[PDB]
């Protein structure tokens, strides 16, 4: 009876964003995103490509309660290079990267017989 | 009451197997073990699925209306 | 040819073995979890009761119903009815079928998800048409009915995903492993005397090289190359699953992008 | 003597003794159909008893349930009693 | 073709109004179920 509708998981309710960019106070040159319907998959997923480039100091996201598929990413930028940016690059990565493997795994699977 | 339709755990359709199972055993007079495998049912919580089935609809079936 | 690379060990209807590396292990798994749970599917969401004379209820019904596979190679084009600007469902957000079946005999009369019926137009588009990989082509053994039982349904499948219901999922159960041999230490292994002889070995090590005995501890290795193999209920081709799996975690990234510039 | 109770949908009539509970799924006989949705404190069954013109007497579905009635029987105790029992599922 | 009521042995769509005790035809067993429903009900697939 208390139970949300399923559809909540991955469809943004009224007035919900996709994205919330809230500057850090804590430290300079750090911001705090949220998530609204995403969960790991997203979350783990970009903060793995936000820490290949050595100019995020810091980088982290938590899903504070599983009952909310939300969670909130934050980054920590050198001075002069934008956090926003710094997302902006992450997703293009996990796509080109996301564009060779379908490549990829297509090719191979044309090769195979049966 | 009726097979699973899927296992719970994983999802691999388990229902339209019964019958075939059911069969394996009674004319092919094979163990459990073997036929379960032979329905394609690898992993435990699929096996599990099928071997522990009880067919109720069956005795349910038994009464007149 | 680029970053992420497959090696293809296996392949047919219903299951592929590949070995993806040059991958994080974030990538290995986030398009692992897509695939489990977020991938469009067609499976009945909707069920009408005309008569019901069987010994099972209505929703008991209802539920194995929801829960039969159904061809959704097109679903990429039909529309959730939720944006659909109809007023609840059509032939351009749902598909209609119907399952009819009368105890006949007094053999015990079986219906199967063959019995189901499409009755809306299917608009040349595969998609929707129960799913058999039975020896006999009786895919899914729905309900019995005995000498006069009735049971009159019609049936509404919507595009759905996982997340909603389990039901829409296409994925069957996804096998997962990287470092065969704990080269990685990512894992303690629980031993009671030799843990090298207590805990098996996995096929994958025959597929990497041993670790030798006196070599130190490789502290800057990560988890490169993965050995998966995802099954396939059927829905969807397996190769499939995998391509919109890809295509789906692909898309979802790019609507951050998309979000940032609204922004 | 000449005081009876009837399964019957009731309407006010100098008592008005009724609760927010909906009448609606009554069907004339005061029983709801098998295949007939339930929930709140719907009624389940209407019933009257006309006291020495008409208080209401007759079962709520149970506050905290809701389900959907799965058959009704209608049968006579001994003394010619009218008996019903609703199942709901 | 209508009906109220239905025996729990010979299934016949019996159906009587008033000062009709409890009864079938042939079928004196007092109990009778009632029926079914005519607007069908939605179901819920999940
Ligand atoms: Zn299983
Ligand atoms: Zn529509
Ligand atoms: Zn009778």
């Known amino acids: 009876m208390n139970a949300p509708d399923r559809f909540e998981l991955f469809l943004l309710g009224e007035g919900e964003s996709k994205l919330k960019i809230d ?21 783990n997923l970009i903060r793995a490509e936000l820490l290949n480039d050595r100019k995020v100091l810091f980088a982290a996201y938590k899903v504070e309660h599983p009952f909310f598929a939300r969670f909130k990413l934050r980054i920590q930028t050198t001075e002069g290079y934008d956090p926003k940016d710094a997302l902006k690059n992450a997703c293009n990565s996990i796509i080109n990267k996301l564009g060779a493997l379908k490549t990829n795994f297509e090719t191979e699977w044309n090769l195979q017989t049966l | 009451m009726i097979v699973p339709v899927r296992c719970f755990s994983c999802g691999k359709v388990v229902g339209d197997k019964w019958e075939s199972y059911l069969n394996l055993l009674q004319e092919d007079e094979l163990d459990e073990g073997t036929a379960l495998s032979r329905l394609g049912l690898k992993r435990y919580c699929c096996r599990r699925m099928i071997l522990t089935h009880v067919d109720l609809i069956e005795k349910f079936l038994r009464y007149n209306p | 040819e680029e970053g992420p690379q497959v090696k293809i060990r296996e392949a047919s209807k219903d299951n592929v073995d590949f070995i993806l590396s040059n991958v994080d292990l974030a990538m290995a798994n986030s398009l692992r979890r897509v695939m489990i749970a977020e991938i469009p599917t067609l499976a009945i969401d909707s069920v009408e009761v005309e008569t019901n004379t069987t010994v099972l209820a209505d929703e008991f019904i209802a539920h194995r119903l929801g829960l039969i596979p159904l061809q959704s190679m097109d679903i ?73 039982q009735e049971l009159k349904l019609t049936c509404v499948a919507k595009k759905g995903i996982a997340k909603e219901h389990a039901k829409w999922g296409p994925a069957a159960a996804i096998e997962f492993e990287y470092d065969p041999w704990n080269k990685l230490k990512h894992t303690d292994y629980w031993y009671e005397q030799d843990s090298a002889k ?6 994958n090590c025959e597929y990497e090289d041993p670790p030798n005995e006196g070599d130190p501890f490789d502290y800057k290795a990560q988890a490169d190359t993965f050995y998966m193999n995802v099954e396939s209920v059927g829905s969807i081709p397996v190769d499939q699953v995998v391509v919109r799996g890809i295509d789906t975690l692909q898309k979802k990234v790019a609507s951050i992008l998309l979000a940032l510039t609204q922004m | 003597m ?48 006309p006291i020495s013109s008409k208080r209401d007497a007759s079962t709520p579905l149970r506050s905290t349930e809701n389900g959907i009635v799965d058959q009704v029987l209608v049968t006579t105790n001994q003394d010619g009693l009218k008996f019903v029992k609703v199942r709901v599922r | 073709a209508t009906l109220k009521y239905i025996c729990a042995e010979c299934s016949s769509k019996l159906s009587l109004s008033r000062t009709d005790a409890v009864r079938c035809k042939d079928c004196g067993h007092r109990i009778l179920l009632k029926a079914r429903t005519k607007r069908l009900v939605q179901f819920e697939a999940r």
């Not at chain 1, 500057?23 to 979350?43: M, Q, R, S, Y």
């Not at chain 3, 189901?116 to 009786?138: F, T, W």
């Not at chain 3, 207590?198 to 096929?203: A, D, G, T």
């Open chain 3, 198 to 203: 207590e805990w098996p070995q996995s096929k």
């Open chain 1, 23 to 43: 500057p850090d106070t804590k430290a300079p040159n750090a911001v705090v995103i949220t998530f609204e319907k995403e969960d790991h998959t997203l979350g």
């Open chain 4, 2 to 49: 000449s005081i009876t109770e009837t399964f019957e949908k009731p309407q006010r009539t100098n008592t008005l003794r009724m609760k927010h509970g909906t009448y609606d799924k009554l069907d004339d006989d005061g029983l709801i159909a098998p295949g007939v949705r339930v929930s709140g404190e719907d009624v389940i069954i209407g019933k009257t008893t």
């Open chain 3, 76 to 148: 990429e084009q039909l529309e959730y009815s939720r944006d659909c600007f109809c007023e609840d469902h059509c032939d351009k957000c749902s598909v209609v079928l119907t399952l009819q079946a009368f105890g006949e005999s007094e053999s015990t009369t079986n219906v199967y998800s063959k019995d189901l019926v499409i009755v809306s137009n299917l608009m040349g588009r595969n998609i929707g048409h129960p799913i058999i990989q039975d020896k006999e082509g009786n895919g899914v053994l729905i309900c019995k009915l005995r000498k006069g």
